[PDB]
Structure formats: structure tokens, C-alpha cells
């Protein structure tokens, strides 16, 4: 039924029916005939609108439920759209972590259009969360200083949904959503001196840390991964029964009643009780054993990246290191090439956060969320560009993606309904984004460059490129019969391209049709 009515009756009145209805609506789902889990209530974004922003007067966009792609040659126009979406998501993240809290806001000296006589700017959005809660609107606003009136934001409908997720989870555990952004700034060098140590990378809510920053924290992954090794290698429950020795057997020999020595017993007995309290507290949630957490990540990394077949941790003379097998030989992380390192830096960061946030599932990678990526092909050779989309979409079945590109090889792999074309007027502005005429999925590359991008298949600035076309005009003028002017071209083509090449095979065909089968038919019929 109505989720907001059930939560109202529960809150007030303090109930078991009203609590149970709130927890079931979030947790129900079923298994598909292919063996994939699908939840009963989906979550996704539906529309965006911008007014007097930076160079846009008024613009509207419609988004697909599975995958959307933006194309065109202007870089700053495309980049400004992803910046406006990432501001809006920050208000959900702040309210899941703590009561009250605040998101980010627009800037008065950069974001308002320079010459709009209204002197204010707005950004507007709308989400969906299944049949019982079909619309959630939001607005962000600002205006110039010294005006007769003022514009404020409107955010209450967004705060209300995030409170339901935070309140129910403290009574009895649930799964939670993921939000992330990956920018052009992700390509940077790797520091091999991982000497830094701290005790914070082991809590369920460190998964939301830095998540909208634009690059990800690959330094935090390496600290987390070697910690799972040192605890799985030797069972730490042994340390409890080891501390129980002095705690249980100093007791009977702490003679003389002296405050100093008996404080040493009191301190070890205190410390042991505060240690065991964490082993007790861990039972309050279905936290997977470290042996299972370690196993899931290694299969994901190895399945998606084309050249890596194994990964492990080992101890040198005085510290631990990570090794991989790459092209059949064994190396450290600082010996991989840039196209290999940058793509692994993406997959490892996204895989950790999902295994921390979804502890109750059978396969943690089947959860929900929204992900933004900028230039999709970067340091990748043509053979990998044919398969990067299919590998990601096979590994993460229920996430929504939004991406940008200009390679024609990547477009051969997607349906035309997913495509939005960007083409500014003079000094900027558009009202709507369109889609192309031809079908892209499964078409040949030479047509896509001509019809979708307006570029020829042969370089127009090179003299040798044209002269096969000039031969056809010389063969036509004298009505399909050879002369010296045709013979000099025929010899020059054969001299440069060689004898078996396609240019000469194609030129021979023109003579052989346009002479005999044309001439003899017309002359005989006469």
C-alpha cells in the first residue's frame, strides 16, 4: 500500500503490523529463469531541466532505465550536464549518515547566466521508487545580491525518503543503495611506499567516504585487502583464550593485596572484556566471514579485465606485497602498463563498496544504485573497444549507467533508442536532444563515419587518393572505350598500389562490363 501512511502509523503510536509492512516492501523479490535476482521495487531517475545556467536558456532531457549515451564534438557542453546531476545526489548521502545534515549548493559568481534579466537560476529533477511511491521532485536555486526578492531551494520530499532507510536499519538490518562518479582525473601515477597505517578502514559506513570526489581511493583498497590476509591466515579467536590465561590464573596468585600489581590484573581483565564486546557486537548483523569476502572480489577482478588470470598476497623479508600473473608471467603492480593499471583501478573500487553494503544477499554484486563515467575509451586498443560494454553489463545486472564517447567502434554495439545528439546553435543554446535515423546495432563501420559523423573513408588532402575516380570519367566521355589518357592512369594505378590490390581489381571490372555487354547488346538491337 502507501509506504508513507504505514510509516506515519508506526512512528506515532509510540505497532508490529506497521513495522512489518515497512520492512517487507524494501526486501521482497524473486529469482529469474536465468538464475538472476530481481527486486519488486526499482529505483531510478526520470527527468532533468536547466534554466539560466551556464550558457543554457532552457533545456529538457529524457533518460533510459538501462543505459544512456551522449554524443557530439563540444567538450564543455557535455561535461556541464554530469556536474549538475552529481550536485543533486549529495543530499541523499548526507541524510543516510546522520540526522539533519546538509548537501552542496550553487555558486553566485560562476553558475548564473551572464545577461539573463531575471537574475536567478534553477535546476530541477524527478525520481521513481515503485508503484507505492511513484514521484519525488527536488529544486536547487540562487539569485544575485541587492534584489527586491529572494529564491530558496525545495528539498523536504528528499529528506523524508532517506529517514525511512535510516530508522528501519537500526532496529533490524537491511541492504542500502550505491552512488559514484569517475572523471578524466583518474589517470595518475601509483605510490609504492604504502607505509601508512590507521584503524578506520573496517566499518560498514566507510563505504560512503569520498564517493562523489571524481577519482576513487585505490590507496584504501590495498590497505583493506592485506588486512583480510593476516586475519584469515590464523584464527583470531585464539587470542581470546590466550588472554584468558593470565586473566584467569593470575587471580589465584595476586598475593600481598598491593594496589600496583592487582591493577595489572584489573587492566588485563578490563581489556579482555572490551575486546570480547566486539566479537559479541559482530553477531548483531549477518557479516560474511573474511574467507568469503576475500573469495568474491578475486573472481570479479579476474573475469572482467582481459589479461589477468590470478592475484595473491605474500611476505618478503620484512613486509607483505601484492602479485599478479599477467600474459603468463608474475609481476608487481608498479610494472603494469597505463592502459592495464587505469582499468583495474576502476573495477576494484566499485567491487569493494558493494560487498560491504549488501551482506544479506547470496551474490552481493546484484544490488541497486546509479553510476556516472566520463570518457569511456581511454588508453584502449581497437580489439578491447568491441567488448568493454558487454563485460561490465554482464557483471553488474541491476545498476543504471550514464556515459560519454566519440569512437565509432563502440556505437556499433548499442540500440539507437539509447543515443542523444548534442549540437549547439551559435553562442550556445538548444531546446531538445535528438536521436539518429539509421540502426547502429550490428552495422558496418564505414557507414557510421559517413552518416552519423559526416567524415569520408579516404584522406581528401592526398593526391593519390582521387585518381581512381578520374579514370571513370575518362572511360565515360569517349563512351566506354580506351584511349592514351585512360592508359597512363591504368599504368600509374598499377605502379603505386601493386598488381593484386583491390583498386586494380575494381578498375578491370568497369572495362569488362561497360565495353562488351553494353556495346554488343545496343549494336545488335540496332
Amino acid at each position: 500500500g502507501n509506504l508513507l501512511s504505514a510509516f506515519e502509523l508506526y512512528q506515532r503510536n509510540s505497532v508490529g503490523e506497521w513495522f512489518e509492512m515497512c520492512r517487507d516492501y524494501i526486501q521482497d523479490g524473486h529469482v529469474d529463469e536465468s538464475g538472476i535476482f530481481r527486486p519488486d521495487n526499482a529505483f531510478y531517475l526520470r527527468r532533468l531541466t536547466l534554466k539560466d545556467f551556464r550558457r543554457f536558456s532552457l533545456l529538457e532531457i529524457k533518460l533510459e532505465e538501462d543505459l544512456t549515451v551522449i554524443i557530439g564534438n563540444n567538450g564543455k557542453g557535455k561535461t556541464s550536464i554530469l556536474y549538475a546531476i552529481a550536485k543533486t545526489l549529495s543530499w541523499f548521502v548526507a541524510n543516510i549518515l546522520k540526522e539533519g545534515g546538509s548537501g552542496q549548493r550553487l555558486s553566485e559568481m560562476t553558475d548564473i547566466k551572464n545577461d539573463a534579466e531575471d537574475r536567478y537560476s534553477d535546476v530541477s529533477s524527478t525520481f521513481f521508487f515503485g508503484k507505492g511511491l511513484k514521484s519525488v521532485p527536488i529544486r536547487l536555486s540562487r539569485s544575485a545580491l541587492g534584489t527586491a526578492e529572494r529564491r530558496d531551494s525545495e528539498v523536504k520530499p528528499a529528506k523524508d525518503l532517506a529517514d525511512i532507510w535510516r530508522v528501519i536499519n537500526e532496529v533490524n538490518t537491511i541492504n542500502l543503495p550505491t552512488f559514484a562518479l569517475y572523471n578524466v582525473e583518474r589517470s595518475q601515477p601509483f605510490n609504492r611506499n604504502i607505509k601508512d597505517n590507521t584503524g578506520r578502514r573496517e566499518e560498514r559506513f566507510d563505504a560512503y567516504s569520498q564517493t562523489l570526489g571524481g577519482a576513487g581511493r585505490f590507496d584504501h583498497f590495498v590497505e583493506w585487502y592485506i588486512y583480510l590476509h593476516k586475519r584469515t591466515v590464523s584464527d583470531i579467536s585464539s587470542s581470546i583464550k590466550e588472554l584468558e590465561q593470565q586473566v584467569n590464573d593470575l587471580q589465584r596468585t595476586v598475593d600481598g593485596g598491593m594496589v600496583s600489581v592487582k591493577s595489572l590484573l584489573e587492566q588485563m581483565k578490563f581489556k579482555l572484556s572490551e575486546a570480547i564486546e566486539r566479537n559479541d557486537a559482530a553477531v548483531s548483523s549477518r557479516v560474511l566471514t573474511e574467507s568469503v569476502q576475500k573469495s568474491i572480489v578475486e573472481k570479479a577482478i579476474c573475469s572482467v579485465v582481459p589479461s589477468i588470470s590470478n592475484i595473491w598476497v605474500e611476505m618478503i623479508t620484512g613486509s607483505d606485497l601484492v602479485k599478479v600473473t599477467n600474459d603468463g608471467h608474475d609481476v608487481t603492480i608498479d610494472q603494469l602498463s597505463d592502459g592495464q593499471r587505469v582499468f583495474l583501478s576502476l573495477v576494484a573500487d566499485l567491487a569493494r563498496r558493494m560487498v560491504m553494503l549488501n551482506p544479506l544477499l547470496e551474490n552481493p554484486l546484484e544490488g541497486r544504485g546509479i553510476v556516472l563515467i566520463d570518457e569511456i575509451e581511454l588508453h584502449l586498443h581497437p580489439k578491447w573497444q568491441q567488448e568493454v560494454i558487454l563485460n561490465l553489463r554482464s557483471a553488474f545486472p541491476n545498476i543504471q549507467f550514464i556515459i560519454t564517447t566519440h569512437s565509432p567502434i563502440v556505437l556499433s554495439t548499442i540500440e539507437k533508442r539509447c543515443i542523444r545528439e548534442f549540437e549547439p546553435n551559435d553562442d550556445g543554446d538548444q531546446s531538445f536532444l535528438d536521436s539518429p535515423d539509421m540502426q547502429t546495432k550490428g552495422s558496418e563501420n564505414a557507414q557510421i563515419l559517413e552518416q552519423v559523423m559526416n567524415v569520408h573513408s579516404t584522406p581528401p588532402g592526398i593526391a593519390e587518393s582521387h585518381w581512381l575516380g578520374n579514370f571513370e570519367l575518362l572511360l565515360l566521355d569517349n563512351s566506354g572505350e580506351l584511349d592514351n589518357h585512360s592508359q597512363v592512369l591504368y599504368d600509374q594505378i598499377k605502379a603505386h598500389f601493386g598488381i593484386d590490390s583491390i583498386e586494380l581489381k575494381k578498375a578491370d571490372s568497369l572495362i569488362r562490363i561497360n565495353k562488351m555487354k553494353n556495346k554488343l547488346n545496343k549494336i545488335r538491337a540496332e
Binding site: D500, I513, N521
Partner: protein, 216 residues
């Protein structure tokens, strides 16, 4: 694979005794005159022009050394190993890539006709002929796999392009048979098949023009 025919041996094959002489002891300049008269300058399996080449023992020397000097056991083949490379079709792949293979499960071009087993599609792919049954079917399948006839991308792309260039010519004729006399329209077809004996990949070009094993 066109149908080959074998003529008399080169006398120099009588000059050496198997197991006494190593096959390295033959002057190879003496034998190419007889392998050329019959093959016409093209590879025995993949039908392309020869510019770098070698002589292949059809039944291997290792397993069957008694055949090292039998005239029926030799063919001319494309590629080389003295000029080095990663070559990946015909007789080099037969040793290094095929794995295992029974010598009696393969078609030989001078004692059977490949037209009883193989079909060429206008898209450039090679397929077993229509209506086959288990014993004929395994010959067609192993012959296509061991010589890699659909798997070398350089071979696939070249053959496809060669057929696709003639199609505007093939439709101009075959659509004038109401204007020409019943014998004149036959002559208008023979003038095409007379050239094709001199080009590349002839078998695929023949399968576009023809209408039966009966000529006209």
C-alpha cells in the same frame, strides 16, 4: 580446391634410396618444373598466388619414412620457414596448430573431387554441401578445420572482397535472356568462364556464374 592430375615422375627421384639418403640430399631446383606445369602458380589448398613457397610431403616424413621419395606424396604450398614468421594456414598449421589428425579422414585433390563435399556462400564462408551424411560429413568437417579455411582473417577478408566486386556484372546478364537468341545467350556466358581460369580464388567465382554441373 581444383581437381589436380598427376603425370610422369622426374627421373632424379630414382637416384636416392629411402633410409640411406636424407631428403636434404635432393637438388630442389630440378623438381619445381613438374610441380608447376600442373599447379599453374597457385597454392594446392587455399587457391591463392604463390610468391614465397615450399614443397610439402602429404603423408609426413616422421611417421612414415618409407614414402620420402614416392612421387605421389609431394605438393607445392604457400609460405616458408627460411624466411621466418607466425604463418597460420596450410601445411605449417597442419603440424603446429591442428593437434591430432587421421591421415585417411582428409580429402586429397588428385584422387577425389572436392565438389562432392564443399559449398561457397556469397558472404565468403565455406560450408559442407547440402544433403550430406555421417561418413561424407566428417571428411568435409576435418578438411575445413585442419587447413584453417574459415579462421585466417586475411584469407576470409580477401575472398569475401573478390566475390563482392563482380556482382553488378552478374546481374546485368541473366536478365537479358528474352532479348538474345537461345545459342547467342550461351556464347554470352562462355566468354565469362573462359577468363576465370587465369584469376585468383577461381572456385568461388565459378559458383556465382554457374547453374548446374551441366555446362552451357
Amino acid at each position: 580446391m581444383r581437381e589436380l592430375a598427376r603425370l610422369e615422375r622426374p627421373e632424379i627421384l630414382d637416384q636416392y634410396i629411402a633410409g640411406q639418403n636424407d631428403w636434404m640430399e635432393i637438388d630442389q631446383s630440378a623438381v619445381w618444373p613438374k610441380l608447376t606445369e600442373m599447379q599453374g602458380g597457385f597454392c594446392a589448398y587455399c587457391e591463392c598466388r604463390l610468391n614465397r613457397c615450399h614443397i610439402e610431403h602429404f603423408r609426413p616424413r616422421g611417421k612414415f619414412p618409407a614414402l620420402t621419395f614416392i612421387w605421389n606424396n609431394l605438393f607445392g604450398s604457400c609460405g616458408d620457414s627460411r624466411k621466418s614468421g607466425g604463418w597460420s594456414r596450410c601445411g605449417i598449421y597442419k603440424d603446429n596448430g591442428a593437434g591430432a589428425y587421421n591421415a585417411d579422414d582428409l580429402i586429397k585433390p588428385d584422387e577425389e573431387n572436392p565438389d562432392d563435399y564443399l559449398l561457397f556462400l556469397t558472404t565468403g564462408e565455406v560450408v559442407p554441401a547440402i544433403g550430406l551424411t555421417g561418413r561424407a560429413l566428417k571428411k568435409a568437417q576435418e578438411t575445413i578445420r585442419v587447413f584453417n579455411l574459415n579462421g585466417d582473417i586475411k584469407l576470409f577478408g580477401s575472398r569475401r572482397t573478390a566475390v563482392q566486386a563482380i556482382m553488378p556484372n552478374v546481374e546485368y546478364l541473366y536478365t537479358l535472356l528474352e532479348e538474345f537468341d537461345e545459342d547467342d545467350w550461351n556464347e554470352m556466358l562462355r566468354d565469362e568462364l573462359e577468363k576465370i581460369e587465369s584469376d585468383e580464388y577461381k572456385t568461388a567465382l565459378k559458383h556465382a556464374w554457374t547453374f548446374n554441373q551441366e555446362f552451357a
